[PDB]
Ligand binder design. Structure first.
Ligand SMILES: *[C@@H]1O[C@H](CO[C@@H]2O[C@@H](C)[C@@H](O)[C@@H](O)[C@@H]2O)[C@@H](O[C@@H]2O[C@H](CO)[C@@H](O)[C@H](O[C@@H]3O[C@H](CO)[C@@H](O)[C@H](O)[C@@H]3O)[C@H]2NC(C)=O)[C@H](O)[C@H]1NC(C)=O
Ligand SMILES: *[C@@H]1O[C@H](CO[C@@H]2O[C@@H](C)[C@@H](O)[C@@H](O)[C@@H]2O)[C@@H](O[C@@H]2O[C@H](CO)[C@@H](O)[C@H](O[C@@H]3O[C@H](CO)[C@@H](O)[C@H](O)[C@@H]3O)[C@H]2NC(C)=O)[C@H](O)[C@H]1NC(C)=O
Ligand SMILES: *[C@@H]1O[C@H](CO[C@@H]2O[C@@H](C)[C@@H](O)[C@@H](O)[C@@H]2O)[C@@H](O[C@@H]2O[C@H](CO)[C@@H](O)[C@H](O)[C@H]2NC(C)=O)[C@H](O)[C@H]1NC(C)=O
Ligand SMILES: *[C@@H]1O[C@H](CO[C@@H]2O[C@@H](C)[C@@H](O)[C@@H](O)[C@@H]2O)[C@@H](O[C@@H]2O[C@H](CO)[C@@H](O)[C@H](O)[C@H]2NC(C)=O)[C@H](O)[C@H]1NC(C)=O
Ligand SMILES: *[C@H]1O[C@H](CO)[C@@H](O)[C@H](O)[C@@H]1O
Ligand SMILES: *[C@H]1O[C@H](CO)[C@@H](O)[C@H](O)[C@@H]1O
Ligand SMILES: *[C@H]1O[C@H](CO)[C@@H](O)[C@H](O)[C@@H]1O
Ligand SMILES: *[C@H]1O[C@H](CO)[C@@H](O)[C@H](O)[C@@H]1O
Ligand SMILES: [Ca+2]
Ligand SMILES: [Ca+2]
Ligand SMILES: [Ca+2]
Ligand SMILES: [Ca+2]
Ligand SMILES: [Ca+2]
Ligand SMILES: [Ca+2]
Ligand SMILES: [Ca+2]
Ligand SMILES: [Ca+2]
Ligand SMILES: [Ca+2]
Ligand SMILES: [Ca+2]
Ligand SMILES: [Ca+2]
Ligand SMILES: [Ca+2]
Ligand SMILES: [Ca+2]
Ligand SMILES: [Ca+2]
Ligand SMILES: [Ca+2]
Ligand SMILES: [Ca+2]
Ligand SMILES: [Ca+2]
Ligand SMILES: [Ca+2]
Lengths: 417, 417
């Protein structure tokens, strides 16, 4: 048929075509025939010049508002004359111009993705809008360089592009929690027009880290004389997760025997291990037990650590003197060398702290004899006369080889008859 | 020195040794010398027979209560005589018997392990107790066959065994949530004695599964006449996690345009997509949008699904008759063939539903002429005489080719002069 191209957004009065000449109307009859555009809308947008017979633009036309996403926009125009009454038809092709840039409906997009999202999961993106059609519509999407995310641009049945964010590699909030990316959409105009949007993705924390001790195990030496309330060690553990999932508390293992809990206490927040009671190298020389650090996650991650506390001997025991047997009363006629008492000594300490020596004052008529290790018998070493002295109080003194030495004193009472 | 072996837990009166004969004491002097055990404890456990001079057990001896975990248990015994007063020493070796079976302090142990525990993490176990020493103490640990856990048995500085549970492969509560294992501890006695304990481990859930749609995408066809409240589709998605982490809810994507939300609604629990308003094939022929299923986990996992709804044309529009120009009044002298009116018809439906035919009753002196598609002019087809009839009401009827057809009626009023 008769087709006139005219670009959209053309100014008022732009020449479309000589409709009178294409309808073969006589020039001299323009004022009588009263050629008019039919249709209220087309009379709003088109008019016929009465003098030349040319079809002119009255009000500028928006192709986007007229045809939307249709590929071709052709507007059939109807014309009317009188005398005689006649109708004519012609087609105006409205040509699209590139007066729309791609534009994201939101220029700021925010995503919250869980740290444990599986690779391959997809996330929708808002496509930019370009009201044009054909080569002037959106032609490509671009995603800035990053290491975990890529673009998966989808082609719809009509030719629309749909960008999707594809997680390619697993995330880790503990290494990087925020990503700032730019998404760009470009049309195929000349020159190409484009628009961008900032996509801020934050990684939500999963409790995927257990607490970590500074060392795998600790070994401690402490003197058995250490006072109650002494800090033996401060355990340090870190947990990189966020919030309560990064909150560390310390405790004894659940199966920790009572003999350990009675002597040691562990501060739940600071991890300071303190001493709660008396230690004794003589009964127990070392303790090994496990402690644990738990985070406040759901479910909780825990890590255990092995502790060994070695005790150091202190010279805290003086010798103990036991008089096994005692004559008590003795006749003055007894010959020198008579065994008067049996004495055993013991010292629970080790090394020089437990080596016992025994002594009595010299001026007495008695002597100490030893036939077995740490065993002494007290015997008569001189003559005895009841009339001179009727009774003896013999002071025996035991000493260990500690520094300073510890001494024990015991008196054996002996009557003479 | 003088050493006598005697087994622990020996009955009263068991022969240890002839101490008198080893101390070279005369048999005839037993009642006078009054050989006695020294020490209250040893007098509780040992006695000397006055007639034979043999050292005998008074009360049975527990080696475990005496030496604990020491490798060697040797008890120095002291003896005393009178007339003259003398002291002797000898050593009794108490030999351990295998009168203790390994026994776990708890025979039921329960562990709660997070599903996302990393392989290589270790978990303490309560070691069994065997009060014996040497080869009679605990000699081995065994863990029943399973696929995720193994045993890491530790050797302490003193020779104690510490069993630890080692996670070798990652867990998955969604495949198996409970493990029943038996831990066995065996000593090295003849015969070996052993004891077992049941360890029930439960796997605590992590929200590591997103909801899964039945299909990756759905495509729906619906007639534009479908009534409001019609269910177009029921979306089904499953989530295998536990509790709220397995609770699925449905929604439109956050970026879903308002033109979609106005026409369709999605039940958050059931996933039924219903129709909320009028559809119109003539203005919009299809809709594509994304819906998402989110679980109630922290953080939430989500999965999207693409929906496309195609509309089907219904013959819901009758033709529209527009009378472009109308003479209104006509002289009776006008020749036949005079164009009286200009008529244009349009039907927005497609195919046969939008093909228009036009007609008027036959007996009238008028006719319909068509020079362009869907355009008709009403012209005079016979002679006219005002005196016969002074005015005409001409009923024009348009019909589409639908089943059933839709009709439009319009009357043009024409005066004759
Ligand atoms: C557990 O941690 C505490 C605290 O350590 C703190 O964090 C670490 C990472 C470092 O930055 C450290 O400087 C911080 O205080 C440890 O306590 C500290 O341990 C130091 C040994 O590396 C120790 O030197 C320091 O005490 C000082 O020592 C100086 C002599 O070297 C003295 O002149 C001074 O007066 C202090 O007495 C100590 N500080 C405190 C406040 O405790 C602790 O050792 C860690 N535990 C384990 C088992 O490693
Ligand atoms: C979403 O799920 C529903 C419900 O499905 C239920 O779970 C699945 C795993 C099956 O066990 C199913 O039997 C359960 O009802 C689906 O609804 C059902 O879909 C069936 C198609 O597979 C459909 O046949 C059924 O309707 C019946 O159809 C029969 C004729 O084949 C009729 O004779 C009968 O009267 C029903 O009209 C329907 N049932 C219900 C209660 O809806 C639904 O299709 C799924 N959606 C998608 C998109 O797959
Ligand atoms: C980190 O946690 C501590 C301790 O939490 C306790 O142990 C948890 C495993 C769980 O059992 C909680 O219910 C316990 O509260 C928090 O310290 C507490 O702070 C409050 C004051 O706000 C105080 O009244 C409590 O007594 C404290 N708990 C203890 C055991 O002393 C601490 O607030 C947490 N850290 C942060 C940053 O919130
Ligand atoms: C599964 O969840 C539903 C819905 O939970 C809602 O959506 C969540 C994502 C979150 O926003 C919640 O705060 C919402 O409640 C539960 O259904 C609810 O049940 C209560 C009665 O107990 C009812 O009053 C609410 O209205 C319901 N919610 C809706 C949206 O209708 C349901 O109980 C959960 N399943 C289980 C097994 O607990
Ligand atoms: C968007 O991208 C286009 C081409 O990629 C540029 O021409 C424009 O300046 C904007 O950066
Ligand atoms: C893409 O980048 C431009 C700046 O070049 C912004 O204007 C836009 O908002 C988006 O960040
Ligand atoms: C424990 O194990 C020992 C040897 O392994 C057995 O002898 C005993 O019967 C029990 O099963
Ligand atoms: C090991 O197995 C035995 C049964 O043979 C139980 O007695 C014990 O409690 C543990 O289950
Ligand atoms: Ca425009
Ligand atoms: Ca345009
Ligand atoms: Ca454009
Ligand atoms: Ca991590
Ligand atoms: Ca943590
Ligand atoms: Ca984390
Ligand atoms: Ca002591
Ligand atoms: Ca000591
Ligand atoms: Ca001492
Ligand atoms: Ca015993
Ligand atoms: Ca035993
Ligand atoms: Ca045993
Ligand atoms: Ca899993
Ligand atoms: Ca889930
Ligand atoms: Ca799970
Ligand atoms: Ca319609
Ligand atoms: Ca229709
Ligand atoms: Ca129709």
């Amino acid at each position: 048929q008769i087709r006139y191209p005219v670009p959209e957004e053309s100014q008022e009065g732009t020449f479309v075509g000589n409709v009178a000449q294409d309808f073969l109307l006589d020039t001299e009859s323009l004022s009588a025939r009263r050629l008019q555009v039919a249709g209220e809308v087309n009379q709003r947008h088109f008019r016929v010049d009465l003098d030349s017979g040319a079809l002119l633009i009255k009000n500028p036309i928006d192709r986007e508002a007229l045809c939307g996403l249709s590929a071709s926009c052709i507007v059939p125009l109807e014309f009317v004359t009188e005398g005689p009454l006649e109708m004519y038809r012609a087609e105006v092709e409205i040509v699209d111009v590139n007066d729309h840039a791609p534009r994201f409906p939101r220029q700021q997009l925010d995503l919250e993705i869980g740290e444990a999202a599986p690779p391959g999961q997809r996330f929708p993106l808002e496509k930019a809008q370009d009201a044009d059609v054909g080569s002037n519509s959106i032609s490509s999407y671009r995603l800035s360089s990053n290491e975990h995310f890529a673009l998966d641009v989808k082609k719809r049945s009509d030719g629309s592009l749909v960008p999707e964010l594809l997680l390619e590699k697993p995330l880790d909030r503990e290494k990087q929690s925020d990503y700032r990316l730019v998404l760009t959409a470009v049309d195929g105009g000349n020159p190409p027009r484009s628009g961008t949007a900032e996509l801020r993705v934050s990684v939500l924390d999963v409790n995927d880290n257990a607490p970590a001790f500074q060392q795998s195990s600790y070994r401690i030496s402490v003197l058995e004389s250490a006072p109650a309330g002494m800090v033996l060690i401060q355990l340090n553990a870190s947990d990189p997760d966020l919030g309560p999932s990064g909150n560390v508390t310390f405790s004894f293992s659940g199966h920790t025997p009572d003999r350990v809990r009675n002597l040691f206490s562990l501060h739940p927040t600071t991890g300071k291990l303190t001493l709660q009671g008396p230690l004794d190298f003589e009964s127990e020389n070392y303790y090994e037990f496990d402690v644990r650090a738990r985070d406040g996650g759901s479910p909780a991650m825990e890590q255990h650590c092995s502790l060994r506390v070695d005790l150091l001997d202190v010279n805290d025991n003086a010798p103990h003197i036991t008089v096994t047997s005692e004559l008590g009363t003795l006749p003055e006629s007894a010959e020198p060398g008579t065994v008067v008492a049996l004495i055993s000594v013991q010292d629970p300490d080790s090394g020089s702290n437990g080596d016992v020596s025994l002594r009595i004052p010299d001026h007495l008529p008695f002597a100490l004899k030893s036939a077995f290790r740490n065993q002494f018998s007290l015997v008569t070493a001189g003559p005895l006369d009841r009339e001179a002295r009727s009774s003896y109080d013999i002071m025996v003194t035991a000493s260990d080889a500690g520094n300073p030495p510890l001494s024990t004193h015991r008196t054996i009472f002996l009557n003479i008859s």
